[PDB]
Automatic annotation (TrEMBL), chain A:
List of residues binding chlorophyll b 5: W60, Q120, E128, R131
GO cellular component: chloroplast thylakoid membrane; photosystem I; photosystem II
PANTHER family tied to this protein: CHLOROPHYLL A/B BINDING PROTEIN
UniProt-recorded name of the protein: Chlorophyll a-b binding protein, chloroplastic
Binding-site residues, chlorophyll a 7: K168, N172
Gene: LhcII-4
Annotated function: The light-harvesting complex (LHC) functions as a light receptor, it captures and delivers excitation energy to photosystems with which it is closely associated.
Source organism per UniProt: Chlamydomonas reinhardtii
Chain sites annotated for binding chlorophyll b 3: R59, L137, G138
Top-level taxonomy: Eukaryota, Viridiplantae, Chlorophyta, core chlorophytes, Chlorophyceae
From TrEMBL, chain B:
A GO cellular component annotation in the UniProt record: photosystem I
GO molecular function: chlorophyll binding; metal ion binding
Gene3D superfamilies for this protein: Chlorophyll a/b binding protein domain
GO biological process: photosynthesis, light harvesting in photosystem I; response to light stimulus
Binding site for chlorophyll a 2: Y48, H55
Protein name listed in UniProt: Chlorophyll a-b binding protein, chloroplastic
Chief location bin: plastid
Residue positions binding chlorophyll b 8: H55, E126, R129
UniProtKB/TrEMBL annotation, chain E:
Gene3D superfamilies: Chlorophyll a/b binding protein domain (1.10.3460.10)
Source organism of this protein record: Chlamydomonas reinhardtii
Positions of chlorophyll a 9 binding: E147
Protein name in the entry: Chlorophyll a-b binding protein, chloroplastic
Subcellular location, record wording: Plastid, Chloroplast thylakoid membrane
Residues involved in chlorophyll a 4 binding: H74
Gene from which this protein is expressed: lhcb5
GO function terms (MF aspect): chlorophyll binding; mRNA binding; protein domain specific binding
Function in brief: The light-harvesting complex (LHC) functions as a light receptor, it captures and delivers excitation energy to photosystems with which it is closely associated.
Binding-site residues for chlorophyll a 12, renumbered to this chain: K201, N205
Positions contributing to chlorophyll a 15 binding: H234
Amino acid sequence: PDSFWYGPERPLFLGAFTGEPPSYLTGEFPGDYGWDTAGLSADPETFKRYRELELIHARWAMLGALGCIFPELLGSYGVPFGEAVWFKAGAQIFQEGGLDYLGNPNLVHAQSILAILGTQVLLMGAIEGYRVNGGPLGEGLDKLYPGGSFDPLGLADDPDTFAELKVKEIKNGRLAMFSMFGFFVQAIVTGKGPLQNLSDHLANPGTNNAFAYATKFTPQ
Amino acid sequence: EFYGPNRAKWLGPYSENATPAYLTGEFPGDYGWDTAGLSADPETFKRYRELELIHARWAMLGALGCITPELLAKSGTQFGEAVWFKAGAQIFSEGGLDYLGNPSLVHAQNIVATLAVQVILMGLVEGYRVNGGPAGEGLDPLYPGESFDPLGLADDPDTFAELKVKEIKNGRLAMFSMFGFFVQAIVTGKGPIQNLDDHLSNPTVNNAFAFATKFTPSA
Amino acid sequence: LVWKAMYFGGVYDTWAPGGGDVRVITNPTTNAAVIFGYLVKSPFGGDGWI
Amino acid sequence: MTSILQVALLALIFVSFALVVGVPVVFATPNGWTDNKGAVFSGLSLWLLLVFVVGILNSFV
Amino acid sequence: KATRGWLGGQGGAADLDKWYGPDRKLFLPSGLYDRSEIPEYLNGELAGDYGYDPLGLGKDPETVAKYRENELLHARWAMLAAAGILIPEGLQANGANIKGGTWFETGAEMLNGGTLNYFAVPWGIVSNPLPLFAVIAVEVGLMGAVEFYRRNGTGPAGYSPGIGKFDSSVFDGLDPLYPGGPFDPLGLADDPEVLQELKVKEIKNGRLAMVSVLGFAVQSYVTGEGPYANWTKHVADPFGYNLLTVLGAE
Amino acid sequence: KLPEAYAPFAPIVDVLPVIPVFFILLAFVWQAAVSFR
Amino acid sequence: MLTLKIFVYTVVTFFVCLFIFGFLSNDPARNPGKN
Amino acid sequence: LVDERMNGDGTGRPFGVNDPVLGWVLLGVFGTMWAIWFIGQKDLGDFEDADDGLKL
Ligand code: CHL
Ligand SMILES: CCCCCCCCCCCCCCCCCC(=O)OC[C@H](CO[C@@H]1O[C@H](CO[C@H]2O[C@H](CO)[C@H](O)[C@H](O)[C@H]2O)[C@H](O)[C@H](O)[C@H]1O)OC(=O)CCCCCCCCCCCCCCCCC
Ligand code: CLA
Ligand code: CLA
Ligand SMILES: CC1=C[C@H](O)CC(C)(C)[C@H]1/C=C/C(C)=C/C=C/C(C)=C/C=C/C=C(C)/C=C/C=C(C)/C=C/C1=C(C)C[C@H](O)CC1(C)C
Ligand SMILES: CC1=C[C@H](O)CC(C)(C)[C@H]1/C=C/C(C)=C/C=C/C(C)=C/C=C/C=C(C)/C=C/C=C(C)/C=C/C1=C(C)C[C@H](O)CC1(C)C
Ligand SMILES: CCCCCCCCCCCCO[C@H]1O[C@H](CO)[C@@H](O[C@H]2O[C@H](CO)[C@@H](O)[C@H](O)[C@H]2O)[C@H](O)[C@H]1O
């Protein structure tokens, strides 16, 4: 296309020091900064599969980051969750009262983990089978951008706006995946919720940073 | 030898049929070991070669910089902390980080400033390597020469190829040794020179098998 | 101004014990919340803004 | 040496008055800046020399 | 020799019209110094030419070159001297046992039978066991040989400076004050316009070093301490410790 | 008070603060010189 | 009594946001002159 | 205490909020208005060129 994010004049991941990007990264796909130093996308089929994997990971991680942030914020403000922290919310089902959505005893009130696992397995199996092979909500649609019933508001009719929104989606998804990797590492190292880590850093930025835990995993 | 068809191989004599077709002994250190077939595509092969060379050089530097302070401390120099995997924590000491223990050298006390300076300088130099900079622009990505070969030790082609093979072999040895450093530090918990001294003290009992049951999953 | 108050002499602290005097501000309040609470504080009585 | 300091300070005052009276005249007079560069340079240099000398004398008093 | 800029983009000598040619920078601004009064012998040829010559000490181009030789030699010696005056004092004041300390006291440290400690920044500090007379003899012999080589224009063949190209034989044809070749192991002077820019930088840094060394001497005579001590004390107490305070302390 | 060495120059200082005001008046005088062109 | 505070805050915020975003909506080009 | 009060006159709370619902209302209203303005921005004309806008 003819836009700032496509073609040979697109921005690249090393600024002026990037040089010439790899030949197969011609710049016809969203979020193409020409960063394939490892050379894992030489084969176009592998490139397509990696693009699909990246997009699915991006959407899942956007959802995951939002769902990790929101309950802890609400619990900090005062909502009585069973376990507000993202990496502890799974253990609520072992509590005597069971899992309670929003802390209310009349919302969901789940008791058995086996039923949750079984229903999730069935529903998600059907969902992903429909995603791979066309189902009730469209049959002959694109694998990554089905549109149709999944774009009710008609935000992707204009091809130029469609490309712009694709770039925005991929960029926000990459940011979300980076932040989710940060979530995992901070949970492993610090042991507190991400909002707790942010509050601690804001309280004393000079000392409450990552280096404070640097001497945590040293062997003895 | 070390080049062409009749070159040394990764299985010695029992290697005539082991070598893949695409490995034809054109590049240095080509022993024909691609059992997993990860470099069938020539572009991926070139990228892996570049990664291997950079890793080898960094591993050479890392191995030398891990060995040197411990030996110097054994010689009788007070470093504050000589063990390689504990040498980064002395930046938080009250006396700061002093080169060779001398209080009038470096004497760094802030870690954020050092990290920022390293980020800026290393970003600039890595960008110079990728696309070219003050030293030169149109040179080989792996062997620029010119400003990076002042003594001119690489000017006759066969000598250049032999030196390249020596470089790659020393680098593979350094990478293996650095992986050993990491595993020994995780398992044993003492510096590599201390480990060597302990092994020399009593080899029959001071070996890796003494720590076999350390990571038993009993619970 | 910060260097003058911190290293080269000091500033006249009027809240020092007894009558105020010149003092060096060794620990300025750099906390973000405390610093930015003044700006968003109400200007009416009791609060007084900055 | 207060007498020397006071004499130098009075000389500085006189030189400064002469400069502030003359510089606008030299600037605004057509074809005057070209043929009076030396006088203006000497006056400014003398002003700077006198103020520095007064400072040194104050340090000595 | 194809290079790129330090911060990306094209690399080279940028623009050389600021220091060469009829258009250039001068020791006074445009409004105070018209281009007509520039002396005829002060044309945009020599590096670092600001059209500065009150009292007309220079008369014509060959005398200008004769004085340029002395200016460049003095500049390089003053750069070396400023470095060797500043660094050892700062090293000693921070913990090292240099035993020489301030520059104006290092000479007397080697009087009588005394020796001098030499610090190899990265590496240790050694106690150089040479006596004073041996130092004098070695210095006079080596400096005489080197200056005789410089004056004659020819010298011995193939010494060992870590040079990029070895086995130097003849010095014939090398420009005095810029021999290059054997004296340029890194080969940074191959590009001509880059060489001109480097010449300008060299002469400017050298003039700064000359003025700084004169300041070293004068303020060390006045205050009685080394330049490093004066710098640190002034930074610690700007208004308390300066020239005006030092003068007439009693 | 001023330092004793600068004691005799006390009257001059007494006139200094009002000098900027005169500047504005000078402007009008200048306009009178050019007949308010 | 806090419900009144919520209502007043909502109304004031709505009007202030209207004012702020009104002048960001290419206001200087609303003149009737020719340019 | 005879009755109940908010007790926040002289506390100097930021933006005069002492309950998180007030801050949530502030952010929600501001975000809704900003979203409406962002959606309607297409009708205001784009100043993409470097030299554009009312000027003299
Ligand atoms: C003729 C006999 C001969 C044999 C059998 C080999 C075989 C080998 N050579 Mg070769 N070579 C041989 C002759 C020669 N080599 C070479 C030159 C080279 C080079 C330069 C290299 C090799 C390498 C290799 C290795 C490649 C495969 C590998 O990585 O193994 C991996 C699998 C094993 C080693 C088996 C597993 C070990 C053990 C039995 C299991 C351990 C169990 C643990 C306790 C597990 C516990 C952990 C738990 C917690 C999970 C392999 C050991 C490469 C190498 O050494 O990489 C490591 C290499 O770089 N060879 C020359 C010179 C021309 C030879 C001359 O005859
Ligand atoms: C009042 C004081 C309060 C206290 C102090 C607060 C300080 C806050 C400081 C930071 C924010 C300052 C914002 C000032 C207002 C100016 C906003 C503006 O001029 O913004 C103008 C720009 C214009 O953006 C451009 O708009 C263009 C036009 O787009 C249009 O056209 C495009 C195709 O060309 C697309 O089709 C697109 O969809 C279509 O809209 C393009 O899209 C460009 O890519 C795009 O960059 O916007 C942008 O800068 C991007 C948005 C900027 C940040 C906005 C944050 C808003 C709040 C977020 C959180 C809300 C939460 C709500 C929760 C609700 C539920 C509880
Ligand atoms: C990439 C590899 C690498 C890395 C990341 C490090 C990192 C570190 N080293 Mg190690 N080191 C290395 C390679 C490396 N070293 C090698 C190859 C050597 C052998 C020369 C050493 C010898 C060494 C010693 C002896 C000491 C360290 C120390 C340190 C720490 C302080 C760094 C500092 O302030 O230096 C920056 C210092 C300066 C800029 C001051 C000038 C020093 C110059 C640059 C040295 C240059 C050496 C020269 C180029 C090569 C040797 C020449 C010789 C053959 C003649 C830091 C953890 C110090 C420490 O904390 O002890 C544990 C310490 O005492 N290192
Ligand atoms: C806002 C202030 C300002 C600005 C933008 C300029 C800008 C300019 N001046 Mg003017 N000038 C100024 C103040 C200023 N000057 C003052 C205060 C003086 C009296 C000394 C002069 C005297 C002067 C002369 C005589 C001439 C110019 C000329 C010029 C032009 C080119 C040469 C140049 O940059 O000046 C060069 C000025 C200097 C080298 C003075 C030294 C400046 C150094 C960097 C000290 C900086 C101090 C520090 C950064 C700020 C101190 C803050 C506080 C103590 C006040 C340029 C358009 C020339 C021109 O246009 O020719 C036709 C010319 O002939 N200026
Ligand atoms: C580019 C390139 C190039 C060259 O050549 C080579 C290389 C380098 C290799 C490459 C790179 C790559 C990368 C970087 C990657 C990364 C990734 C990631 C990080 C992802 C994430 C990703 C991430 C993700 C998905 C995430 C997700 C999440 C989730 C789901 C979550 C969930 C949840 C929640 C909500 C909360 C609750 O309570 C619980 C749970 C349930 C848990
Ligand atoms: C061939 C093949 C074939 C088939 O087909 C397949 C397969 C098998 C896969 C393949 C194989 C491969 C391999 C073996 C690999 C390995 C690698 C390595 C080991 C690396 C390292 C690598 C390593 C490295 C880099 C290292 C580095 C290091 C460093 C830097 C260090 C540094 C340091 C020092 C000095 C010390 C101080 O105190 C600090 C620090 C800072 C810490
Ligand atoms: C380029 C511009 C730089 C300007 C210089 C910056 C100001 C620093 C110089 C200050 C003058 C020198 O100060 C030095 O001599 C003065 C002599 O009168 C002393 O000043 C003294 O004068 C009187 C006694 O005669 C007393 O009323 C003062 O309390 C006393 O301070 C200073 O105590 C001394 O430190």
